[PDB]
Design a protein around this ligand. Structure first.
Ligand SMILES: Fc1ccc(CSCCn2c(-c3ccccc3)n[nH]c2=S)cc1
Ligand SMILES: [Zn+2]
Ligand SMILES: [Zn+2]
Ligand SMILES: [Zn+2]
Length: 232
């Protein structure tokens, strides 16, 4: 019942209830004549919502907000982008125009600036060192160290045991490394181990793209990263 590319018109968003007061959002985007799904997180914060990641661009992001307004009907007051690439910050202006406070680490803000990407307004302090964790309302934010990118964060919802790995975690179907231009291949397995050691109790693991699963997505990503490392 998890939405895939074939059930999502490009420009539309679906929401998927993972657990109580936790949803993934699913959008699609064309890239290089391919069509990819993309996940984000929505977490109930009392009477308001915390959004994790944009829906990969302004049009998708406006559809996401409209879809939240329709299906949940609670206001999105804050949003966190998990790394500086366009699939996570693309649409930050749309959120901002709708009165959402947008957040990212100084690391992510710096890299987005350098990249010429949209720049979330507010800064998340205390994530600069590997293994750093900080509370952000109904979630914990964790910097495991460099993986898909030097700045990538993961999000844990303690109340629901939902780990959102963002693009540092691959779904099981993805058997080869994705787009690794900005990755730290050498540090990626160690960063996944930090996630393993810090959240052994996670029941649900949501990858940045594709199907959710359990904690084996961590070991899976390790396996894939290592196979890529050994390309010859
Ligand atoms: F099977 C697959 C293969 C690759 C992906 C990733 S599609 C690329 C998304 N992306 C991007 C991106 C940003 C802007 C334009 C294109 C890709 N930056 N970081 C990441 S992750 C997903 C599923
Ligand atoms: Zn990326
Ligand atoms: Zn503000
Ligand atoms: Zn991604």
């Amino acid at each position: 019942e998890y939405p895939t590319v074939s059930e999502i018109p490009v420009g539309e968003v679906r929401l998927y209830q993972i657990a109580d007061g936790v949803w993934s959002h699913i959008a699609t985007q064309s890239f290089d004549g391919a069509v990819y799904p993309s996940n984000g997180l929505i977490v109930r914060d009392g009477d308001e919502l915390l959004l994790i990641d944009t829906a990969w661009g302004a049009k998708n992001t406006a559809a996401l907000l409209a879809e939240i307004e329709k299906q949940i009907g609670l206001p999105v007051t804050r949003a966190v982008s998990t790394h500086f690439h366009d699939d996570r910050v693309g649409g930050v202006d749309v959120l901002r125009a709708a009165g959402v406070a947008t957040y990212a680490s100084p690391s992510t803000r710096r890299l987005a600036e350098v990249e010429g990407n949209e720049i979330p307004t507010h800064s998340l302090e205390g994530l600069s060192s590997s293994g750093d964790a900080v509370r952000f309302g109904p979630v914990e934010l964790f910097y495991p160290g460099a993986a898909h990118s030097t700045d990538n964060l993961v999000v844990y919802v303690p109340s629901a045991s939902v780990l959102y790995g963002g693009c540092a975690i691959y779904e099981l179907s993805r058997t080869s490394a994705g787009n690794v231009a900005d990755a730290d291949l050498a540090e990626w397995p160690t960063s996944i181990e930090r996630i393993q050691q810090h959240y052994p109790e996670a029941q649900f693991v949501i990858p940045g793209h594709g199907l959710p699963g359990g904690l084996d997505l961590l070991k899976h990503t390790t396996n894939v990263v290592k196979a890529h490392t050994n390309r010859s």
